[PDB]
Amino acid sequence: DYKSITIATEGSYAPYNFKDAGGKLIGFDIDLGNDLCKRMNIECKFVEQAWDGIIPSLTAGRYDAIMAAMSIQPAREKVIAFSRPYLLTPMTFLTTADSPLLKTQVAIENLPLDNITPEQKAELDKFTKIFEGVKFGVQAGTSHEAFMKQMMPSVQISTYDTIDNVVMDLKAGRIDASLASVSFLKPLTDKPDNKDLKMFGPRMTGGLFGKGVGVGIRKEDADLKALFDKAIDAAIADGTVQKLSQQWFGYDASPK
Ligand SMILES: C[C@@H](N[C@@H](CCCNC(=N)N)C(=O)O)C(=O)O
Ligand SMILES: [Cl-]
Ligand SMILES: [Cl-]
Ligand SMILES: [Cl-]
Ligand SMILES: [Cl-]
Ligand SMILES: [Cl-]
Ligand SMILES: [Cl-]
Ligand SMILES: [Cl-]
């Protein structure tokens, strides 16, 4: 059935999906998308779509798939189907190198949120108390915003159209902190450009964040999902996902 497909991406989330000097779409999602389509024997075409409206445009049939650093989270699973994860990454916090937030002790280094034990709640409640009075910035319509609204409601948040504006305002001093995956924050903080920025706090997984990043497909497209899952399994097994992860992220975030 599928001879050619249209894949949507945002183009504002480096190193997953962004634009080069000549304005062409580049990144991990573009390289993986093209490699998966070569395996599937499907012609590949990448389109730019803003984050707000990326899910409704998929359901409306404007394109066939989404490859835009999209977590397989339970709220999204109610609307669209996902492929098996092509990348696994926890979530962490971001601040400036001079922030007093960096002197706060982390009791639980890795925080799994599917089940929240009293000890895990105590750690989340500690950070909530510390984050009150502190200005937070998040990209709108992400699991970052969902986390802040559900798990830390007492904390003041500002929502941004893109993650680039969040980073811009954090450097300008208009916000004091943020949150994203380690897959986004490690290559951002590894840059000598961003020596003034630091990752801090616990590394969270599960709950509302779900498990991994997957390809977004329509629920009625069961055959396209099966094709993507077979292609992803083969790309993981031969070391392609590991090779592309080292290239774009500077570390191995591929599933095992
Ligand atoms: C991996 C990535 N996932 C977030 C943010 C992705 C936003 N993607 C985009 N702007 N293209 C999410 O699915 O809510 C992250 O937490 O860092
Ligand atoms: Cl491209
Ligand atoms: Cl093949
Ligand atoms: Cl799975
Ligand atoms: Cl431990
Ligand atoms: Cl190769
Ligand atoms: Cl290459
Ligand atoms: Cl590594």
Residue numbers in the entry: 27 to 282
Cite, word for word, the article reporting this structure.
Two Agrobacterium ABC-transporters and their cognate periplasmic binding proteins (PBPs) OccJ and NocT import octopine and nopaline/octopine, respectively. Recognition and import of opines are conferred by periplasmic binding proteins (PBPs) and their associated ATP-binding cassette (ABC) transporters. The PBP OccJ is associated with the octopine transporter of octopine-type A. tumefaciens while NocT is associated with nopaline uptake in the nopaline-type A. tumefaciens. OccJ shares 47% sequence identity with NocT and belongs to cluster F within the PBP structural classification.
In parallel, we produced the corresponding reciprocal mutant in NocT, in which Gly97 was replaced by a serine. As expected, the presence of the serine at position 97 in NocT abolished the nopaline binding ability whereas octopine binding was preserved but with a 10-fold lower affinity compared with the WT. We thus validated that the presence of Gly97 in NocT was essential for the spatial accommodation of the α-ketoglutarate moiety of nopaline. We solved the structure of NocT-G97S in complex with octopine at 2.35 Å. Remarkably, both octopine molecules overlap and adopt a similar conformation, unlike observations in OccJ. Moreover, Ser97 exhibits different conformations in both molecules of the asymmetric unit of the NocT-G97S-octopine structure and each of it is not compatible with a bound nopaline.
